Amino acid sequence: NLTPLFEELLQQCPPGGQNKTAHMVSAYQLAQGNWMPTSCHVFMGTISARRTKTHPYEAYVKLRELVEEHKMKPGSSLGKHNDWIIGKIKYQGNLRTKHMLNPGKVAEQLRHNVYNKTIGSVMTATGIRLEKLPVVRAQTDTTNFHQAIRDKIDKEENLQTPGLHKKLMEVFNALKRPELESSYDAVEWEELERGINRKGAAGFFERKNIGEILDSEKNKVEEIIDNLKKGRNIKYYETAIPKNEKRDVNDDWTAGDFVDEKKPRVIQYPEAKTRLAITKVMYKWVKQKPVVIPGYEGKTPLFQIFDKVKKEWDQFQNPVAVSFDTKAWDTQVTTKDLELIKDIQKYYFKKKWHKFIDTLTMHMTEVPVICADGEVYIRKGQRGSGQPDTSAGNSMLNVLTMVYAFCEATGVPYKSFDRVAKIHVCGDDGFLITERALGEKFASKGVQILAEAGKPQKITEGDKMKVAYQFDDIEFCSHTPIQVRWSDNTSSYMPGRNTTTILAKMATRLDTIAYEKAVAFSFLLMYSWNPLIRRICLLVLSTELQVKPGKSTTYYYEGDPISAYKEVIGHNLFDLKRTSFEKLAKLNLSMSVLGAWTRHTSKRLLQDCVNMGVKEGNWLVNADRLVSSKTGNRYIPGEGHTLQ
């Protein structure tokens, strides 16, 4: 009876190891009685207990009593290499951090959400009520920023199962790529400068951005590579800014705005010179060239991912997908976690970079962080979202932890995972596909195993992980599959997501037509299954055909945008005859719940398209099958290509 109460309490128990000298009893066995807990250190949902004619409620109070005894049982020396930050302190701290040093505040140092006028007025022109759309890209004030630090970052390091990381290494040895052992070397400046955003943000004490440092202070970056390579301390620090601040900029191209959306509330990032030093050396690992993390989908475009996943899904008999959903992952990365990734990096890198990886990793286990306003805190481990290693490091750490959790829950051995499951990851996001019995075992017992591995899962109904029983219930990269029907009698899947959300993201920005047409084409590649969005996209793309699209967003087109689409999607926009009736109903629901559209909106948007398309000429709106059906005119595309 009391079994769900014990299961809740066992997730707060400190992780222990296997105890062969005592009786280890589960949440079920404790609820039945005559079992008395002797300690609260949890191992695979079991704790050590003396069989002493107990009553269920009495066993529960002893186990809670022991858990609170352990919780009510410390300040930490600062590392020498971090001492330099204390000499920059100018005023006493006011972060009021309870678990990490707030040594004070350094001297001060020298963006808003607005509408995209053309995209926003096309929406208004059809009766879409913008004010009813959800708010996106919210920036936060200093006060809630510091509260977010106390809430998420001010914490002792997660305890993990003893020996967890030897096991995880055992999992890596089942997935390593031995033909690459000890081959990774640094890259040349030319190759580094190819894939980098010159507007990459400067750290607190910096003034130049990535491109400016590239142009004029390469020697400063090389001095840093040299110091680390010889094992010498550098003055490593990360800067803290709230999400969506002027300095919340991505160094590298992004598969979509979904990657800004999953960012922590607190962005923490090394200096630009330092992000450059790390990347010039660890390029092949942090940019996954080649891909050595199994299931890593970082380089897969959003319009391909679900077609790729369906092929795996179809090869199972009775497939399910279990979601990876860790609470505030970056805050759950431990020192031992980063050191596990250090050992794996050293597997693939030439020996002359091991002292480099060793010293950087050492710098990353205790990190001076400087807030926008100047407040310093000393972070113990964790991941700063802006580190170059976030995507690659979290992806491997995710894959390893999840294979281990699945393998320990199901009894499948680490070397046999590839035989009964497929895994897919993008940083902490992901899922695996497997047969239904295997997945349900992993989804019920995985919660407790993942809490003991120091990656707690977001609390749910029935203390179970989310299972998808039908393919288009998979959730990945903030999107979910939706099927479309083409006029060549094939079907395929597109990245689907709520229409209210797509409208929000498309209609706003943080601080002109060339940019909006880029956005429109960018959204048209992802959301052509959505007739509302598809038509708003074609109307915007119809604007000022003499102006060429900007380059500051995910994608843009050279030449014709309808032909560019055909090149990456594999069909013509005009050939898309049907979008999944049911899934579209699900993704349009919030439109009506929020009242962002009326009964008139779709017709008015179609009518505005037909009015433009019936007139004499060659109009992008007629690339829409239904619009062209009502105008009797077609769009004849020119040559066109898609770019990043």
Author numbering: 13 to 85, 89 to 125, 131 to 531, 538 to 670
What does the published report state?
The global conformation of our CSFV NS5B structures is consistent with the recently reported CSFV structure with an RMSD value of 0.9 Å (95% coverage) between the reported structure and our representative C-682 structure. These structures together reveal that the NTD adopts a globular α/β fold with an α-β-α-β-β-α pattern. Collectively, these biochemical data indicated that the RNA synthesis fidelity of CSFV NS5B is fine-tuned by its NTD through the intra-molecular interactions with the RdRP palm.
To better understand the nature of the NTD–RdRP intra-molecular interface interactions and whether they regulate the RdRP fidelity, we designed point mutations at the Y471 and E472 sites in the context of the WT NS5B and the N- and C-terminal deletion mutants. Among these five structures, three of them (Y471A and two forms of C-672_Y471A) maintain the WT conformation with the NTD–RdRP intra-molecular interface maintained. The NTD–RdRP intra-molecular interactions are fully disrupted, and the NTD is rather involved in a non-intensive three-way interaction involving two symmetry-related neighboring NS5B molecules in the crystal lattice.
